[PDB]
Scaffold this active site. Structure first.
Site, PDB file in Angstrom:
ATOM      1  N   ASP A  17       5.128   5.418  -0.911  1.00 30.03           N
ATOM      2  CA  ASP A  17       4.356   6.008  -0.040  1.00 30.03           C
ATOM      3  C   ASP A  17       4.900   6.953   1.206  1.00 30.03           C
ATOM      4  OD1 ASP A  17       1.913   4.376   1.830  1.00 30.03           O
ATOM      5  OD2 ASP A  17       3.342   4.956   3.173  1.00 30.03           O
ATOM      6  N   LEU A  63       0.790   4.093 -12.373  1.00 30.20           N
ATOM      7  CA  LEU A  63       0.508   2.750 -12.306  1.00 30.20           C
ATOM      8  C   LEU A  63       1.861   2.162 -11.828  1.00 30.20           C
ATOM      9  CD1 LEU A  63      -1.149   0.376 -11.876  1.00 30.20           C
ATOM     10  CD2 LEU A  63      -1.074   0.149 -14.317  1.00 30.20           C
ATOM     11  N   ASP A  98      10.381   6.340   6.829  1.00 28.70           N
ATOM     12  CA  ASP A  98       9.742   5.114   6.723  1.00 28.70           C
ATOM     13  C   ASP A  98      10.178   4.507   5.624  1.00 28.70           C
ATOM     14  OD1 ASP A  98       8.177   2.641   7.458  1.00 28.70           O
ATOM     15  OD2 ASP A  98       6.502   3.582   6.652  1.00 28.70           O
ATOM     16  N   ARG A 154       8.897  -2.461   1.575  1.00 27.52           N
ATOM     17  CA  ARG A 154       7.322  -2.377   1.374  1.00 27.52           C
ATOM     18  C   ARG A 154       6.869  -1.184   0.792  1.00 27.52           C
ATOM     19  NH1 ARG A 154       6.298   0.564   6.321  1.00 27.52           N
ATOM     20  NH2 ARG A 154       8.139  -0.188   7.597  1.00 27.52           N
ATOM     21  N   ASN A 155       7.480  -0.136   0.921  1.00 31.54           N
ATOM     22  CA  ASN A 155       7.038   1.347   0.610  1.00 31.54           C
ATOM     23  C   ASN A 155       7.492   1.639  -1.034  1.00 31.54           C
ATOM     24  OD1 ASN A 155       5.277   1.702   2.655  1.00 31.54           O
ATOM     25  ND2 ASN A 155       7.097   2.527   3.897  1.00 31.54           N
ATOM     26  N   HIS A 204      -3.978  -4.630  -0.816  1.00 32.12           N
ATOM     27  CA  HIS A 204      -4.152  -3.552   0.234  1.00 32.12           C
ATOM     28  C   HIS A 204      -3.051  -2.677   0.364  1.00 32.12           C
ATOM     29  CE1 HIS A 204      -6.660  -3.274   4.120  1.00 32.12           C
ATOM     30  NE2 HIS A 204      -5.483  -2.519   4.457  1.00 32.12           N
TER      31      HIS A 204
HETATM   32  C1  LIG Z   1       2.247   1.041   0.663  1.00 33.45           C
HETATM   33  C2  LIG Z   1       2.158   0.641  -0.979  1.00 33.45           C
HETATM   34  C3  LIG Z   1       3.503   0.988  -1.550  1.00 33.45           C
HETATM   35  N1  LIG Z   1       1.720  -0.432  -1.290  1.00 33.45           N
HETATM   36  C4  LIG Z   1       0.542  -0.669  -1.894  1.00 33.45           C
HETATM   37  O1  LIG Z   1      -0.265   0.047  -2.269  1.00 33.45           O
HETATM   38  C5  LIG Z   1       0.347  -2.125  -2.054  1.00 33.45           C
HETATM   39  C6  LIG Z   1      -1.016  -2.400  -2.978  1.00 33.45           C
HETATM   40  C7  LIG Z   1      -0.869  -2.105  -4.562  1.00 33.45           C
HETATM   41  C8  LIG Z   1       0.240  -2.990  -5.125  1.00 33.45           C
HETATM   42  N2  LIG Z   1       0.229  -2.827  -6.381  1.00 33.45           N
HETATM   43  C9  LIG Z   1       0.450  -1.575  -7.138  1.00 33.45           C
HETATM   44  N3  LIG Z   1       0.370  -0.289  -6.501  1.00 33.45           N
HETATM   45  C10 LIG Z   1       0.715   0.805  -7.319  1.00 33.45           C
HETATM   46  O2  LIG Z   1       0.831   0.728  -8.313  1.00 33.45           O
HETATM   47  C11 LIG Z   1       0.746   2.095  -6.595  1.00 33.45           C
HETATM   48  C12 LIG Z   1       0.520   2.075  -5.113  1.00 33.45           C
HETATM   49  C13 LIG Z   1       0.617   3.227  -4.381  1.00 33.45           C
HETATM   50  C14 LIG Z   1       0.924   4.290  -5.269  1.00 33.45           C
HETATM   51  F1  LIG Z   1       1.306   5.533  -4.403  1.00 33.45           F
HETATM   52  C15 LIG Z   1       1.295   4.207  -6.637  1.00 33.45           C
HETATM   53  C16 LIG Z   1       1.192   3.031  -7.262  1.00 33.45           C
HETATM   54  N4  LIG Z   1       0.652  -1.814  -8.342  1.00 33.45           N
HETATM   55  C17 LIG Z   1       0.634  -3.055  -8.583  1.00 33.45           C
HETATM   56  C18 LIG Z   1       0.783  -4.042  -9.641  1.00 33.45           C
HETATM   57  C19 LIG Z   1       0.747  -5.293  -9.710  1.00 33.45           C
HETATM   58  C20 LIG Z   1       0.387  -6.003  -8.571  1.00 33.45           C
HETATM   59  C21 LIG Z   1       0.453  -7.610  -8.295  1.00 33.45           C
HETATM   60  N5  LIG Z   1       1.815  -7.997  -8.427  1.00 33.45           N
HETATM   61  C22 LIG Z   1       2.575  -7.656  -9.762  1.00 33.45           C
HETATM   62  C23 LIG Z   1       4.023  -8.290  -9.782  1.00 33.45           C
HETATM   63  C24 LIG Z   1       4.012  -9.616  -9.608  1.00 33.45           C
HETATM   64  C25 LIG Z   1       5.274 -10.433  -9.626  1.00 33.45           C
HETATM   65  C26 LIG Z   1       5.959  -9.878 -10.993  1.00 33.45           C
HETATM   66  C27 LIG Z   1       6.072  -9.888  -8.498  1.00 33.45           C
HETATM   67  O3  LIG Z   1       5.167 -11.705  -9.792  1.00 33.45           O
HETATM   68  C28 LIG Z   1       3.198 -10.262  -8.544  1.00 33.45           C
HETATM   69  C29 LIG Z   1       1.804  -9.509  -8.425  1.00 33.45           C
HETATM   70  C30 LIG Z   1       0.333  -5.301  -7.360  1.00 33.45           C
HETATM   71  C31 LIG Z   1       0.499  -3.792  -7.626  1.00 33.45           C
HETATM   72  C32 LIG Z   1       1.550  -2.500  -4.352  1.00 33.45           C
HETATM   73  C33 LIG Z   1       1.519  -3.014  -2.896  1.00 33.45           C
END
Ligand SMILES: CC(C)NC(=O)[C@H]1CC[C@@H](n2/c(=N/C(=O)c3ccc(F)cc3)[nH]c3ccc(CN4CCC(C(C)(C)O)CC4)cc32)CC1
Length: 308
Positions: free
Chosen positions: A180, A108, A159, A163-164, A40
């Site tokens: 963000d 990504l 901000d 988290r961002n 989310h």
């Molecule tokens: C407000 C914004 C910064 N946050 C989001 O959009 C959330 C939703 C997407 C989310 N996300 C995500 N978002 C983006 O790539 C993204 C979001 C917004 C943008 F403008 C650009 C890219 N990419 C993600 C890839 C994987 C994962 C899963 N995660 C990988 C690391 C893993 C470890 C190593 C900690 O154990 C735990 C599980 C989540 C990803 C980031 C947080």
């Protein structure tokens, strides 16, 4: 093609140049495939996707059930991110606004958000050297570099918080980026949801924002980083933080935080904006910390758990 995006047709200005929806790079919908949900974020679920071996992307989607103001918010989000050009700000590959649901295509970030990363990658008995001080200093530098770019270009983020921030990958060589701009987006287009715990005294009092606002917030981000993803002001509510901060209260150093790092935080939290360092000075101080053996040789605390 959207009715109200075309009816309103808002202009966006950054660094003395004005853009509109016609400047966004429209990617044909047939070239875009969603692979999986990533969690989310802005506008709800963010997805992993691929464009046209293909380009890997993150995809923000606009709910088809949304208000006219949500539509305009989505357009403005695309305009804002598409005009930044810096290695520590997520890139925008383009948009798909002419089919429904509408998409924004972004770099990504395979490491996810920094807060979740720090919490999940804390040193533990099963993973005893999962992170070191230098990993944290590199994340700090990366984000300060992005903030310096925004300051230089007179863009006030409002901000800056863990988290961002996002990471290109979980492993070594990860690069941190600002991911963000939702608060800045809302302010450009015009309370229990304000990020009170990242805000300087003059913000919630007088509603005065400058780049020294971001400096304060960066100080709090630094505390988040060196605490390994704890919520700032542990045990305090938003109103308790507001009163605490406006009366001179500051957070203690995070566990095992080197003094030179904590001193950067306390400079960021100077009551008067004028006394706070700009991001050029913050970067110099992070670099000095990075070159100091006593800082980088300090062990991070091990959070207790099983071997498996
Ligand atoms: C407000 C914004 C910064 N946050 C989001 O959009 C959330 C939703 C997407 C989310 N996300 C995500 N978002 C983006 O790539 C993204 C979001 C917004 C943008 F403008 C650009 C890219 N990419 C993600 C890839 C994987 C994962 C899963 N995660 C990988 C690391 C893993 C470890 C190593 C900690 O154990 C735990 C599980 C989540 C990803 C980031 C947080």
């Amino acid at each position: 093609t959207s009715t109200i995006m075309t009816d309103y047709n808002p202009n966006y200005s950054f660094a003395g140049k004005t853009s509109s929806i016609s400047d966004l790079k429209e990617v044909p919908r047939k070239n875009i495939t969603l692979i999986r949900g990533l969690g989310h974020g802005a506008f709800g679920e963010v997805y992993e996707g691929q464009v046209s071996s293909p380009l890997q992307v993150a995809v923000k989607t606009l709910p088809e059930v949304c208000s006219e103001q949500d539509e305009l918010d989505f357009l403005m989000e695309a305009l804002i991110i598409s005009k930044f050009n810096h290695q520590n700000i997520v890139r925008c590959i383009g948009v798909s606004l002419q089919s429904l649901p509408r998409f924004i295509l972004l770099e990504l970030m395979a490491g996810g958000d920094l807060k979740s990363f720090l919490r999940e990658t804390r040193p533990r008995p099963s993973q005893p050297s999962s992170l070191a001080m230098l990993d944290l200093l590199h994340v700090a530098r990366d984000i300060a570099c992005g903030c310096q770019y925004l300051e230089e270009n007179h863009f006030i983020h409002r901000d800056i918080a863990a988290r961002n921030c996002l990471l290109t990958c979980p492993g070594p060589g990860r690069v941190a980026k600002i991911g963000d701009f939702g608060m800045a987006r809302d302010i450009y287009r015009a309370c229990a949801m304000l990020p009170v715990k990242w805000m300087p005294p003059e913000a919630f009092m007088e509603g005065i924002f400058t780049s020294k606002t971001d400096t304060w917030s960066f100080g709090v981000l630094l505390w988040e980083i060196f605490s390994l993803g704890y919520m700032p002001y542990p045990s305090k509510s938003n109103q308790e933080v507001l009163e605490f901060v406006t009366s001179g209260g500051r957070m203690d150093p995070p566990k095992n935080c080197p003094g030179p790092v904590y001193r950067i935080m306390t400079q960021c939290w100077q009551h008067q904006p004028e006394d706070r360092p700009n991001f050029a000075i913050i970067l110099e101080r992070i670099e000095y910390c990075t070159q100091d053996p006593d800082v980088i040789n300090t062990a991070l605390p091990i959070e207790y758990g099983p071997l498996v």
